[PDB]
Amino acid sequence: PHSMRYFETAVSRPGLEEPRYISVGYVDNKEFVRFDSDAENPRYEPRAPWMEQEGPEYWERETQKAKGQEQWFRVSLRNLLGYYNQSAGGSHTLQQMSGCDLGSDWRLLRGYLQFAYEGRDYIALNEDLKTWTAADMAAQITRRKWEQSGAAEHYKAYLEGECVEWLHRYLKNGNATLLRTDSPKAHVTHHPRSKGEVTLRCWALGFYPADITLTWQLNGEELTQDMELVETRPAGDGTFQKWASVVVPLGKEQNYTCRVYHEGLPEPLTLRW
């Protein structure tokens, strides 16, 4: 389940030559590095404690590569403008996600490489790291252009090599941080809703990693389609929050139970109002 990813974003700035470029790296969904074109002094920066292990040459090297990406995204955005017959007067976006996943056996599980224009799928490298999948006609142009040039082999090499190399290293250096858990602190609240009905909220707070499952049950059945589940949100200190509520008849609250499943919980919790 381990993984590493770099989410890159280039936003064109009408009238200007250089687009804004932002690169964020992640290991097991935790931001660990970031480069922002706007900074007073553009440079990849540490975003996780365990990254303080890297010497000055590391940041120097990563920063140079970023400069290279800036140019690539700059030219690509210009090309895309042409593909879609768009005007340069407006702002446009080109995004890229790339990285690798490790299975339970530790070998490489899969490599990834996908691009999006204006926030929509554009083109993606298939799992075989040899063929491309284009989302539309414009992308078809890119696809045919890249097959003829053999870009796939370039990406495949990085994805099966350097990507795996550094992921193992990072997982090794930040082991104590990345492999930790903070089981959720949960509780149920009771709120007025409408006549003869009340709301019961099951809260899960300060947990890590973000993965979690909250369920409600009524007489042995999970209330799948009658439960409001909010989207997981960051507490701001590295941990997350989430809750699921149900509307129940006033007087029958005791018939409902909430279960919390998290990897920091050897046994699922079971609460009720």
């Binding site: 770099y6 690509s76 252009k145 890249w146 040039s149």
Partner: peptide, 10 residues
């Protein structure tokens, strides 16, 4: 370690 895109642009 970040990737450096292939010489071919979109």
């Amino acid at each position: 370690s970040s990737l450096e895109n292939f010489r071919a642009y979109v």
